[PDB]
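Example record

Each entry pairs one chain with its bound ligand, iron/sulfur cluster.
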Amino acid sequence: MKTIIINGVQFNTDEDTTILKFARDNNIDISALCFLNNCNNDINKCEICTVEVEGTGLVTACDTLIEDGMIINTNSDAVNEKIKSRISQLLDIHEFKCGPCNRRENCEFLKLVIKYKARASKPFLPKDKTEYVDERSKSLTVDRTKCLLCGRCVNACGKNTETYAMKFLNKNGKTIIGAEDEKCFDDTNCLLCGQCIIACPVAALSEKSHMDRVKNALNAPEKHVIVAMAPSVRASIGELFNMGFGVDVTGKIYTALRQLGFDKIFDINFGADMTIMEEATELVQRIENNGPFPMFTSCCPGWVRQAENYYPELLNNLSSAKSPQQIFGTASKTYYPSISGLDPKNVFTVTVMPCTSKKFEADRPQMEKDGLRDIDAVITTRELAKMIKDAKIPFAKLEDSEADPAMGEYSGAGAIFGATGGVMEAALRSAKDFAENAELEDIEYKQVRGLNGIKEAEVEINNNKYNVAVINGASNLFKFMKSGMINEKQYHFIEVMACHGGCVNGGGQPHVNPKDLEKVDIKKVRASVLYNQDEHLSKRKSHENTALVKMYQNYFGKPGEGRAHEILHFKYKKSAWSHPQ
Ligand code: SF4
Ligand code: SF4
Ligand code: SF4
Ligand code: SF4
Ligand code: FES
Ligand SMILES: [Mg+2]
Ligand SMILES: [Mg+2]
Ligand SMILES: [Mg+2]
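Structure tokens for the complex follow.
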């Protein structure tokens, strides 16, 4: 048990904890920069969390345990002068030009610069930014004129994915962050999940922009531009318009998209119901064929890359149903012309995703048919927010509108896709009706929901028991495989999401500062919007989507065979054996 003095205030406590956490718990202000996800930059501490421990001197509060007898001052002249000096030294390596910067409104560094009134000793004005910028990836971009070498991306990659695809590198004697051997991230084991972006306090890591693709299509006279947003966008984008957390902004988005000039307003949740139609049918086919088991979901492109890069032997076990993005895009170039008269070559299909890996998915060479891409552009939640703001659209004051129904209606099963276990729950609702030839009333699968990293359940389908697992985060996929859990029982159907919490925590999502992350459970609060939609929607099974039923009846035929299997499916194949590697 210990007695601590902080700024003249005595505390008696038996906690073993850092100075930073104790102070934050007790409403004592201490700044921090490189501390995130319970780690700081061990090899280059930022020291923004400096406090004074009398008799010891200046210490980093984020990684120093409280001890009995400690006398701590967090706000003395020596403390503030040290912190201001560290910020000044960061300004010496930082192109401090906030005007055009993509983190201008929510940058953690600018906040600290303002708080400590810090100024560079010599302004950093690189004349040739070409050498600092890497835009080679289909998903990520790096601007090292902004990089603080705080290490948050390196730490976040290891924690979220355990790939360590984000590394410190020695480039010509100086330290940078980047991919293995300074390669393009796409050419490495990187998942392109963008958790590194989410962890970055500044504009050093970003998504690969598709905004010019979209603007050029909107302005082209002959192009008919469809837009469709992912489940998670409607639960998240309001954060960037000062509306707070957990706000359902679906109807405002539809209105904003119309004001941006898009020609048709659809919804990827329609694609989610499509994916369930194909994937639940496939699961039932596998049950009747007594294999092959397990089936894995195939809708998360971060997981697909993880399987390609680390578990190629599982590729044959992935469901062949395209992801909602790609299945929707395929239908947008085939079914949609059939009900509209549009020339398929003039359709330009844009999605809004919470995800950077979806850009790589959309750009895969074979994601096209008859020369027409399934998906022509993917913009992140952050990109859509900037597009709205650039157009001076008053998002928070917009009236609600509706999607165009033909590829815009969605069931409550599609609505929950963006949360971990959502795909599993949605798929079970259709699979059990399909296999039992029934219209079952009990449709809620709460046992697969929530933030546990590995969630297993036994389910009864047509009077048999099957084992399902929901793998929640790429690091948890490694744990499930490396620990042998995949062999502890026979699994039949496994959902994998690369981002812990599901797509609501994807790499294209609004940044959240560390203090808000402590006060708000962002993964739960964003997901709550989706579960709330499902609870109150009339149709809660994908196969009850009336517009989807019409599309299958009039165009595709039966799911899982014939034309539907021919055009709505995509199989990944391992590389053939060769030597060397
Ligand atoms: S990263 Fe932050 S401090 Fe740096 S230029 Fe952008 S907004 Fe300004
Ligand atoms: S995209 Fe994901 S896997 Fe790649 S470096 Fe970033 S965090 Fe790591
Ligand atoms: S890219 Fe961002 S998170 Fe990574 S070290 Fe640089 S500033 Fe920190
Ligand atoms: S969990 Fe969602 S946001 Fe994250 S990589 Fe997968 S598809 Fe993208
Ligand atoms: S926040 Fe403590 S060393 Fe960076
Ligand atoms: Mg440390
Ligand atoms: Mg136009
Ligand atoms: Mg198949």
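The chain has three domains: 1-124, 125-208, 209-581.
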